[PDB]
C-alpha cells in the first residue's frame, strides 16, 4: 500500500459516517467516542482515496467529491479497537477553528489497513 | 431503595458476568473495559442482594451464594454508559492483593438503579 499511496492508486471502498467535533487532536479513545456519536446519528457508500495530496471521499451514487482533506491538517488516525472495520481520523478545520473526527466503516478491509495507508500519506506528504 | 438497603430488603434480578482483574481502583472507563472482557468470555442468573452487610449474589438454579462481598472492600461502582442495564463494581481482593471488577446485567432495572443502591450501601456501612 505504501507504493500505492505514493503513486496515487490507493483507494478503499468505505461507508462514510460523517464527522463530529472533538476536543483533543489525537487519541484512540477520543476517536472511538466520536465514532459512537456518529453511529448513534445513514452512511454514504463511496471510495476513500489516500495519497500525499489528500484524503478524498467520492460518493458512489453521485460520483461527487464529499470529503477533500489536505494531509497537512490531519493530526491523527486510528482503527477502531472495538470494531474490526472501523476507522477514523482527526483533522483541523481551520475555517471554524475546530478539531473534527471523520468516521468510516471499511467495506472490504480492516480499519488497520486504512490507518496504515493514511500513516503512509503522512510520511509521503512530509517527504515532499 | 435507600430504606430497602438499610432494612436488608433490597435485591435485584441479575445475570452475573464474573470478574476480571483491573489495575485501577475506580473509573467508569476502567469498569467498561472490564465489562468488555467479561462479555467476550455464559452469565449466571441470580439475585444481587444489596445491604450494609455486603453485596451477595445467589444463583437462581442452585440457590448457592456465589458472591459474598463486604462493603468495606468495594471501592467504586458504576452503570455502564454504553449499555443501559449494565452495572459493575471494583473491589479489593485482599487474599490475592488485586483489584477486581465484577460485572452484571440487570434483568429488570437500569444499571443506574443498581449503582445508586450500592452507593447507599456505602453510606450505610460508613454510618454503622
Amino acid at each position: 500500500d505504501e507504493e500505492a499511496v505514493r503513486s496515487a492508486t490507493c483507494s478503499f471502498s468505505v461507508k462514510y459516517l460523517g464527522c463530529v467535533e472533538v476536543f483533543e487532536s489525537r487519541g484512540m479513545q477520543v476517536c472511538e467516542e466520536a465514532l459512537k456519536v456518529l453511529r448513534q446519528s445513514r452512511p454514504v457508500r463511496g471510495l476513500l482515496h489516500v495519497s500525499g495530496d489528500g484524503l478524498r471521499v467520492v460518493d458512489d451514487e453521485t460520483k461527487g467529491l464529499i470529503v477533500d482533506q489536505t494531509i497537512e491538517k490531519v493530526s491523527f488516525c486510528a482503527p477502531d479497537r472495538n470494531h474490526e472495520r472501523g476507522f477514523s481520523y482527526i483533522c483541523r478545520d481551520g475555517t471554524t477553528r475546530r478539531w473534527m473526527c471523520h468516521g468510516f466503516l471499511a467495506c472490504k478491509d480492516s480499519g488497520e489497513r486504512l490507518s496504515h495507508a493514511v500513516g503512509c500519506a503522512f510520511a509521503v506528504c512530509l517527504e515532499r | 431503595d435507600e430504606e430497602a438497603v438499610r432494612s436488608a430488603t433490597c435485591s435485584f434480578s441479575v445475570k452475573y458476568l464474573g470478574c476480571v482483574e483491573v489495575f485501577e481502583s475506580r473509573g467508569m472507563q476502567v469498569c467498561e473495559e472490564a465489562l468488555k472482557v467479561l462479555r467476550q468470555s455464559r452469565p449466571v442468573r441470580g439475585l444481587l442482594h444489596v445491604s450494609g452487610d455486603g453485596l451477595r449474589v445467589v444463583d437462581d438454579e442452585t440457590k448457592g451464594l456465589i458472591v459474598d462481598q463486604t462493603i468495606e472492600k468495594v471501592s467504586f461502582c458504576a452503570p455502564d454508559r454504553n449499555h443501559e442495564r449494565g452495572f459493575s463494581y471494583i473491589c479489593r481482593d485482599g487474599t490475592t492483593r488485586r483489584w477486581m471488577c465484577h460485572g452484571f446485567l440487570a434483568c429488570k432495572d437500569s444499571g443506574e438503579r443498581l449503582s445508586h443502591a450500592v452507593g447507599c450501601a456505602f453510606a450505610v456501612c460508613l454510618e454503622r
Binding site: 489525537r26 494531509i71 490531519v74 483541523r92 | 452475573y16 470478574c19 472482557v37
Partner: peptide, 17 residues
C-alpha cells in the same frame, strides 16, 4: 475462582501544519 475471567496501527502526523 470459577467466575474469574482471565485476561488474554495508529499514527500521529509529524507534518501537521
Amino acid at each position: 475462582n470459577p467466575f474469574e475471567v482471565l485476561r488474554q496501527a495508529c499514527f500521529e502526523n509529524p507534518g501537521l501544519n
